[PDB]
Design an enzyme around this catalytic site. Sequence first.
Site, PDB file in Angstrom:
ATOM      1  N   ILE A  34       0.826  -1.210   0.000  1.00 61.36           N
ATOM      2  CA  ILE A  34       0.000   0.000   0.000  1.00 61.36           C
ATOM      3  C   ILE A  34       0.860   1.261   0.000  1.00 61.36           C
ATOM      4  CG2 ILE A  34      -1.822   1.280   1.183  1.00 61.36           C
ATOM      5  CD1 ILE A  34      -2.699  -1.431   0.125  1.00 61.36           C
ATOM      6  N   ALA A  36       4.374   3.457   2.350  1.00 64.92           N
ATOM      7  CA  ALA A  36       5.659   3.328   3.029  1.00 64.92           C
ATOM      8  C   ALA A  36       5.506   3.678   4.499  1.00 64.92           C
ATOM      9  CB  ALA A  36       6.690   4.245   2.382  1.00 64.92           C
ATOM     10  N   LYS A  57       2.077  -4.406   8.361  1.00 66.92           N
ATOM     11  CA  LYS A  57       3.260  -3.556   8.443  1.00 66.92           C
ATOM     12  C   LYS A  57       4.468  -4.463   8.643  1.00 66.92           C
ATOM     13  CE  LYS A  57       2.019   1.009  10.192  1.00 66.92           C
ATOM     14  NZ  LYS A  57       2.290   1.962  11.296  1.00 66.92           N
ATOM     15  N   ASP A 150      -1.120  13.385  18.307  1.00 67.54           N
ATOM     16  CA  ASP A 150      -1.027  13.654  16.866  1.00 67.54           C
ATOM     17  C   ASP A 150      -2.359  13.357  16.158  1.00 67.54           C
ATOM     18  OD1 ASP A 150       0.438  14.350  14.433  1.00 67.54           O
ATOM     19  OD2 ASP A 150       0.779  12.222  14.068  1.00 67.54           O
TER      20      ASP A 150
END
Length: 273
Positions: A34, A36, A57, A150
């Site tokens: 998908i 990086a 991942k 975040d």
Amino acid sequence: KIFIDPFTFEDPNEAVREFAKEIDISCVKIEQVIGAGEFGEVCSGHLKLREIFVAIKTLKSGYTEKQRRDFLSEASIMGQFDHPNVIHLEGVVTKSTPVMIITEFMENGSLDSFLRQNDGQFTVIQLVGMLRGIAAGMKYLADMNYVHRDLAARNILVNSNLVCKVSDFPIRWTAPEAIQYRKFTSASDVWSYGIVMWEVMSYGERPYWDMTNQDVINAIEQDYRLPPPMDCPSALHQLMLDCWQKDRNHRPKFGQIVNTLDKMIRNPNSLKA
């Protein structure tokens, strides 16, 4: 339950075995790449434990002890959460190469990109529904005493049913007190959530547009606040302003945010303004 910082463990690996399910590599099948990642590639595939689609991942070969630790911390963290609007961890692969983290698959990917590719394509009730799901996921994290730090649309994933889930376990997304005194709290995440509301109603527009970070900082200092996105209900923008209250104590809590959004959904006319 309550959130436990994996790095408080004398041995960070202990947190992994406790909050993350070890998956035999023979169950994982990487189909395509998908994007990086910070520690390697981000792929899509199937997990057979009824086979299901999953996000995968991988950790780049030749990784250091620390890189492996930081990579897997995402799982030692995600694994402690269990909420419809928080990305689900299936498990990790650490007893084989390459090391992997397997999570639920989100067909629509990142919310900011998703919205840009679907500019003006949703109803107001659908967008409010996305914001509701995000606030719910955040209310849950805040309840667990987990400060995200975040929160931003790029860090929210979207599934085929438009369900939005918090992921990623920035200056123009961060509260003033958080930037100045590095004081990160759930109230700080609420300011961020307000920016997310703007991104969502703006269909992925960049907060403060071409403004520089310093300009944003100065702007906020001068009591400047982002205007309401085109066709954005007044009640929604008001909620945004409440999230951007200079005093963090004056900002609404995620529980109150979810209630306000739910009242809007129950009384659609409130969005007519």
